[PDB]
Symmetry: C4
Subunit: 348 residues, 4 copies
């Protein structure tokens, strides 16, 4: 009866539940290191990865990304020959880093070969439920065939799942079940773990095997990134904040005089039609080139590490302290009792 | 004698939107999982869904469509004894379909049950505002005495003491939910309730000890809430709202707010009481038209299969016994719905 | 010491919307329950409702209507002494009806009270912002010393210590509520309050020990809040907002965007007061028609409340009802949701 | 159990509270509001007759605000978004208007000493060493550098939200510590940088540290109503600093624009794009507008009125009593809802509400 009595024990935290407490600082925002190492083959100058979705990352996005010091993951919602071409395309553009997503399917190894042939630096085996036997067995197969290949497996939300995938041979683990802006998983399936807690629990375990974790989803301001990083993540992955960018796939859609870009979940009827969906379709404001959005994110990270007296991303993960707050805390934490006049480059 | 007074405020209650089901090790796919449940020795559903015995939800056409999706429908009692019998008769003739009927706690109650059973009703539901009553308990005994083979679903209850009381009265199944209803105002007019997830849980806890199943009834807005109700301990769930905008439900379509809509109302609302015949405990409204019951039920189950997939649950018994929740704040709720993106299309299972 | 410093944030407060009443075994139906209540040997009420002693809620006509429904009106003090004395007189010579009058702590308090006792007032209500004031305590004492029989309702307090203090000065009834009122801005303008549910309970905890009934005053937006207040230990509740749109309330009906409305305002707002800054605002509520249709919906909900708790009477309810606590999500589930509302119900707007 | 894993497993332990979370608990009172004392001592040479400082923002304080505040018994901080000689002129302008107290902000920069020199020459009564992060090595280094050169100068340093941080500035020479990272109405620090401590707790944790040394603290940011000020003082602050409640009064800088029939003034953060441009950047504030409130004397009379009310509610005769004794009760979001006007359509403006 022990499981029957534990159903409602666990409590979970999300980004907007917390604040990073300022700490003794000696280091200024321009001075801090934002470098990060996923592995031997995989080093990033900025801890950003653009999501593997048909409205977020194709060749042009992955390249603009890699030249910012970050990383692109080509979505798998295309042919095999096509993804391999675009992966090779990013590689011929200055010999820089590139990712490709593969689903746990029958044609998975066929896709992976063609991808390793095009010289991917990391494949991402993405699935709804990374804590699954099929997902384990696949990572085992792939680890067997390509012992040299960076393997990103997700998604997971628990310690148990983080361990299952590490042991199967995945060297980077991906955290997030249901925090995405376009995600309906928690609504339609009732399943999830608040992202902060899920980064924190998966990192605690992953820390032991010296394995890094990517916070995926739920990030809507630069300060969310800081929180996710400080809660244990090595790197964050973004969808919505990148979808509005000129280099992202999909052509600009006009709306109320303004310019927008389509942004849909890979699990939406829209993405799949090209069945019970776990995602929706919509649009985000046109934002400009990747370059200014990148600027605002990193600068936020830079100011947070400054506040936290963290010289590198390591010191931040291992030293940053949070403070929990109520919903009224959240109200104070955003602008309040003033009517906004101008748009800020980092706020709505 | 101070114990009762010092304890007025010790209990805490959780609901659907306070929690999330935690993903567990899975070796099963949504399609591989089984959603069948056994409610008793004569009542078995292929999907854990029951359409509410309300006058804007279930009549003969609703029950027939329900039974065909693998579920069940409860024919409401806002009609004549005779007419309700015909409706049960009608459902029965269309392929040996299952069907339930609602009966109130009155003096006409035995007379009404006599007809529904001669009509071959597969279960009766004694629905009341306060299922923890002598009036209810004595009526459940009275029926169980007369009809010892009859599937009795009794309610509504929100407590373990109450669930135990109706089981020892002879109830096969216990219906859980005081005040959780979408059209319901009980908690506002009378102050009384238990948050649904906790009510299902405390009750499932008692019903288990005796081998009795509970029915989660009310407060389900999306399919994820169904998984939560089942995972909390309910064998089966009862939906009003999610079903009222279906083609097979009674009533006609009307255009409102620029599209098609159906009338949805509470049985304790001023409207519904006029037809049937105290201070009202429900309101009258309308919900969007959704077309055939089939497409709705396909999303319902589809979400259920997805959840159980995430929970490594090959069947509903596993999900009841094993699923773990994690409590979350209001901010957790916001992360759990689509956010910070403008939606351009009604998704089949969202808004 | 350093005790006061470290305990600044220890306490926790709950309000009507924090909580639900748990359904209990019930032998009884709504129509069979008793809603009578006894404030004191002199004052007994057929229904647990007093109307607020404000200049836009209760004058003679309200007080008379209340009494006739089995409740009680408090005639506010925003008039002259001769005006309030004849207001009482009118209510009394209108069938031998119970009536109450407001008095504040000040110089001519005794003269007004003198005039009120002469006119046969049943209960004097010592309305002040801070019942736990030294000046309030001194005044309750003087009135008790002069009128050993007279019912004294003294308010307002939010703490067990204040309640204890009023009871010892001679108060027969204590009125509980700092800040929860619909028209009130005390909490906002002065940072000061206690959540009404915790307040009623805390004071009831102290008052029960001396057998003194408390009034849960302000904060009631629906029928169930009243069930909650009584179940938290109040003997009776006092309403202003729920009663302000009633036909027998002072104030003529005003037209605004076509719909009938009535003026409703705090007694500490600018208009009512005409040295200190306002602690109230001035507003408007829809017309509701006769008091009786409003009372019937109120008692109706109370009765359904009592039937769900298995309470034959209000003493059972006070001593036995159990609450359960919930988050914001639970309150969202507690109100009707995910449905367009078509028409108004007579008890939910 | 190790040294390495201490910080890791304390990450989520702390709890923060803010104004909207709590309520002051009424206590026995023998004192009427008009009898209480709102006088407050920040240091031997800096006594305020009312507990209110006009924040040092370009949309808030300049000579006219500073003058008007002082004549009410408060203080104004001339902002630094202007030249050195200009800022000293503003100071002299206030000092040559009846020897009114004035303070003036200075950041941590090479010219800081040049500026400080110029302000002291103008008889400034306090320098506010104002920075985004009070707990920075530079800020401590500056306080020390200034204290050394000006042993009698009043040095108000900010901004911090922790006892650890508050101890550093005190040990470095600040007479008065300013509290608040993120609570500001025009602030986005918490959104863009993720960082902050809820202001009520922040005021409390710092006051706890500071009172051991006999040092006052300033609640800076987050006050929307007079009641919030009272919570802030009762949480341990000697005095509050206000932006948005002062931003839209006659004496504040800015023209009177009008939209939809009503009067407004611009109010922007100092970390906003607008404020920076005056002297790509990654802002930590936003620009907007607030209602025109009219002459300062009205906002101030309402403010001090709320305070006296709450002190009477708390049986406080002076602010020291309130700091030492005031108790809070914690509430939820249904309580905050009950704590505002509800279920009535408000038909006119209370001078102190909305
Ligand atoms: C990213 C994502 N979910 O998080 C996604 C992507 C495409 C399709 C889908 C669909 C087909 C809608 N959902 C699933 O495949 N859900 C699912 C759920 C549980 C298990 Br086990 C296996 C799959 C989901
Ligand atoms: C509450 C409810 N369903 O949950 C319902 C349904 C129809 C009519 C009613 C009416 C008759 C308006 N209300 C009640 O019967 N309320 C009620 C409440 C407690 C007790 Br005991 C007996 C009756 C209620
Ligand atoms: C809050 C309230 N009734 O509940 C009320 C009523 C009338 C006037 C007032 C006024 C005079 C505006 N406020 C106060 O008198 N506040 C107050 C505060 C503390 C003390 Br001690 C004495 C009075 C308040
Ligand atoms: C936050 C604030 N005042 O409270 C303010 C004002 C002006 C400029 C700024 C800018 C330049 C945008 N931000 C910073 O200076 N941020 C910052 C953050 C951390 C550290 Br360490 C040093 C500086 C901030
Ligand atoms: O349709 C889907 N359903 C659920 N999750 C999705 C879907 N499509 C993408 N995601 C996840 O959502 C992430 C982006 O979340 P966002 O940055 O919060 O917009 C992606 O990286 C995926 O992990
Ligand atoms: O008017 C009434 N008052 C309170 N609850 C009601 C009333 N009518 C029906 N219900 C309950 O609400 C359930 C439907 O809830 P829904 O699925 O949220 O629409 C029904 O199955 C009944 O249990
Ligand atoms: O203006 C005032 N400021 C604060 N509270 C008031 C004021 N005037 C009346 N009250 C209280 O508010 C109660 C009515 O609150 P309501 O029933 O929620 O409308 C009255 O009975 C008084 O106790
Ligand atoms: O640009 C900004 N970003 C963050 N905080 C600011 C900024 N400008 C001023 N502040 C702070 O916010 C306070 C004013 O907050 P308010 O009274 O809530 O408007 C000031 O006294 C500063 O401490």
């Amino acid at each position: 009866n022990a499981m029957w009595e534990s159903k409602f024990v666990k409590e979970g935290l999300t980004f907007d539940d917390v604040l990073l407490v300022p700490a003794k600082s000696d280091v200024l925002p321009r001075e801090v290191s934002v470098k990060t190492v996923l592995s031997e083959s995989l080093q990033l100058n900025i801890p950003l990865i653009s999501a593997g979705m048909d409205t977020v990352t194709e060749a042009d996005m992955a390249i603009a990304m890699a030249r910012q010091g970050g990383l692109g993951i080509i979505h798998k919602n295309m042919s095999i020959e096509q993804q391999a071409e675009q992966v090779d395309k990013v590689k011929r553009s200055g010999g820089l880093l590139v990712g490709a997503a593969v689903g746990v399917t029958a044609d998975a190894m066929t896709r992976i070969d063609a991808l390793v042939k095009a010289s991917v630096d990391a494949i991402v085996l993405d699935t709804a439920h990374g804590h699954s036997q099929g997902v384990i067995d696949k990572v085992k197969e792939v680890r067997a065939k390509y012992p040299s290949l960076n393997i990103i497996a997700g998604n997971v939300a628990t310690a148990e799942a983080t361990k299952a995938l590490i042991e199967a041979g995945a060297n980077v683990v991906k955290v997030g079940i249901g925090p995405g802006s376009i995600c309906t998983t928690r609504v339609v399936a009732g399943v999830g773990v608040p992202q902060l807690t899920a980064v924190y629990d998966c990192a605690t375990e992953a820390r032991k095997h010296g394995i890094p974790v990517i916070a995926d989803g739920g990030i809507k301001y630069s300060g969310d990134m800081v929180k996710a990083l400080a809660a244990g993540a090595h790197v964050v992955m973004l969808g919505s904040m990148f979808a509005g960018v000129a280099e992202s796939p999909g052509e600009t859609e006009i709306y109320q005089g303004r310019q927008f870009k389509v942004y849909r979940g890979m699990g939406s009827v829209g993405a799949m039609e090209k069945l019970v969906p776990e995602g929706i379709e919509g649009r985000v404001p046109y934002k400009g080139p990747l370059a200014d959005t990148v600027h605002q994110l990193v600068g936020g990270l830079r100011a947070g590490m400054g506040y936290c007296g963290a010289q590198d991303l390591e010191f931040l993960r291992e030293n940053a302290q949070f403070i929990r707050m109520s919903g009224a805390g959240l109200l104070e934490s955003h602008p309040h009792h003033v009517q906004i006049t101008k748009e800020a480059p980092n706020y709505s």
